[PDB]
Specification:
The structure is cut from a larger assembly and holds 10 protein chains of 10 kinds. By secondary structure, chain G is an all-beta fold. In chain G, about 0% of the residues lie in helices and about 45% in strands. The chains are: A mainly alpha, B mainly beta, C mainly beta, D mainly beta, E mainly beta, F mainly beta, G mainly beta, H mainly beta, I mainly beta, J alpha+beta. The structure holds one RNA strand.
Chain lengths: ~110, ~60, ~80, ~80, ~80, ~70, ~70, ~80, ~140, ~80
Amino acid sequence: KATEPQMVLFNIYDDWLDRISSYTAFSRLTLLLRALKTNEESAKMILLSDPTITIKSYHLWPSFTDEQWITIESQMRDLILTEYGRKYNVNISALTQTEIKDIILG
Amino acid sequence: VIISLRNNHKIIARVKAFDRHCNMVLENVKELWTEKKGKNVINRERFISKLFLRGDSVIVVLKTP
Amino acid sequence: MVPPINCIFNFLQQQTPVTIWLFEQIGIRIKGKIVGFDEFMNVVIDEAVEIPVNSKGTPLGKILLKGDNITLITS
Amino acid sequence: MKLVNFLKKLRNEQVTIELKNGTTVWGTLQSVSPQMNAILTDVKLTLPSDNIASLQYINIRGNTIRQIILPDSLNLDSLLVD
Amino acid sequence: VAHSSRLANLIDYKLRVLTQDGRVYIGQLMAFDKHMNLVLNECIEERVPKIKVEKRVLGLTILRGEQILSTVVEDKPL
Amino acid sequence: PVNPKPFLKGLVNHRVGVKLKSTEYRGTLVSTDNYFNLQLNEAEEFVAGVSHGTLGEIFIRCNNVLYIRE
Amino acid sequence: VSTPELKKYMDKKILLNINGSRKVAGILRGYDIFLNVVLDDAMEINNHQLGLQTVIRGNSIISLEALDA
Amino acid sequence: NGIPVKLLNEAQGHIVSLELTTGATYRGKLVESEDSMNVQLRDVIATEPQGAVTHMDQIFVRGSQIKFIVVPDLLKNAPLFK
Amino acid sequence: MKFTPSIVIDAPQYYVDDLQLETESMPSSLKHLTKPTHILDLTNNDLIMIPDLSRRDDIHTLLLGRNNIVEVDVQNLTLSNNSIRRFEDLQRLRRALKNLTLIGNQVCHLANYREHVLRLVPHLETLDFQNVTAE
Amino acid sequence: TLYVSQLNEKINMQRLRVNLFLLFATFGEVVSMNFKKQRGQAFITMRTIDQASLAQISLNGERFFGKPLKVEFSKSETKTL
RNA sequence: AAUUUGUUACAAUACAUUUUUUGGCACCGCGACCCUCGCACUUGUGGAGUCG
């Protein structure tokens, strides 16, 4: 919607600083953006699965509770492993933890 | 948003499409009803990914902020 | 011939005791005075009174009863 | 504007359909009319606690179809373009 | 049965037909409508009382589309 | 003199209650159209004269309507 | 589009079989393309008349079976 | 225009049978029919949904409330269809 | 002249005096009728055993006149003029059936043939065009 | 067409016609009213004429629902024929 | 030793408020008895009495 060159500021963390440290907040940012790099619309469906939790006006990520953010970290995390196995044709049950943590981190 | 329906179905879902007839394309769909042959009390609900809807069904749509 | 629209108009002109029946609803009736007229059977009827049918009387205000659920008129 | 157009665009989709009488209908939409009359192929009728009945071809009427349950993968925005 | 596109292209096929009341009309579609009314050549109404199929042969029947739910193919032509 | 549509128009931004094909309603009218579909704020659901729940912002479909009242 | 040819039934008493297993009687005074009926009043079927004249909506009519031949 | 309507019109004169939404079958000489199946019939018997039968003179029926119409099998032959 | 799909597809199809198909040594390939018939006429053929049917939910009448039925593997079954010889060969009909006709079969002359059918196939109401009575 | 009379008129019309169809199908591919006039009678129409003749000779006096049926060739040709 | 052009006709490519598709949805027969022997094209078909 921007037809003109301009600077615009945004907020990644919404307010995650109260309940979540910047380390872990940026880490979950990196993971979420990896699934947005890879899975795209499905990772979106994990956000919009329950529409009764809506994205706020100021913010970017829809506001969940701590347990919900954790379970979302589980689903979103596992997405990268699933797609790894799909395209690379390498079963997850044949994998060593170093490779799983590496792929999820990168 | 939530929708009330002729057949006692509370449709909590994300709206995608809209028209004259109030037909709707729906994502993140979560219906609510009760399969119950009397006397009985059960409360059931199912998730559906994508779902088209017909307008005669719709009684009252509502928006919970 | 006396058309329905004409009859309705006449009723409106008069302001007389109108007793409406409900479509697919036996137990309830309405009783008031016709104020409005529409292209369809819909009208506005001020000083209306809901009635439970004899198989008493109940409080009710000013109302427009929708044209699709009308059945009977008399005025 | 029109959902009819969208419906038309949805072709050859293996979908469930739900009626005003609650009948669940698993079939491949070969075509749909301008008035939502669904034409299915490879059809499977089940009720909402009893046994199943399968059929090759079913033309269901538009007034009956309450909710057509769409496929798993679908790009909706694209579909919605004129 | 064949893999048709529309109803019109499968004219004169023996047809199962369901209606809102729960009856099942069976017969060859002679003619269709803008509002899905059906002419049936040799029509048999088959009903189920609340057990086992009750059966009535009607004959040549005009069938209103309002009451029609859905149509299915019973057999081939002839 | 008073037709229905003009009455309806007048009654915008005012309290109304609706019965259905049955459950009573109660809320402030936002706007209306030719088809007599409704949009209300502060909706309260009178289940046969018993306010079961307060929904708030709602949209009633026309064909299920029975009558309008203050 | 076409007018319901009820000119045969004009000014005759008719059993208007109406929605919900109910009935009406009365002499036929008028009608329209939607099959609304305007009739000089009679009873609802033991029996009790309401009104001087009556108007029945089109949708509501199951049947209008002629009492007089 | 509807061919079923045409057929109905043709059946004028003949003894048609006629069930409604209520499920109350009639049989009689078809006096007049219209585009909307607004049938009139003469010398007409009237079966109740439960069972009992009642003779009656000149019934009118509105097509909205009509379910299905049986026409005599002679009309099958000619010459409306082709 | 095998009962084949091709055979069934060119066979006279009509509404009888029910939807009936007009029809061989062995009953087979009935799948191709697509369960669209209320009646199937297999009269004057050479079938030996009433067997080989697919699941046919429609089929209510089977006319099997003048064949060679000697063994049995549905509301009306007409088996006139066939080869059923022992009462025990009629036993499989207990698992079905209201109208049964077995005339002109050797089995008919066996002692107690009528009573045997009545006790073993009680669902039959009319046997050989005679009312099964209480007595 | 063959004309049958002396039939047990207690059988319901649709059952009579269905047993008649069944019985007579043995001779070739195949009208009965319960009015006072027509009760106890039926007209059975066959595609082939040889079938009608065979039926007539072979089922003369066949016990049907308790009575021996009497068969004869019809006086006129059937409308369907 | 079928192809192109023109003309004529038919069919196909619009919308929710009473008659169709924006729904008023959902929670004679079976036991008994006896009458009728009649050449047709059918709402239905004997009559008395008992059972549903």
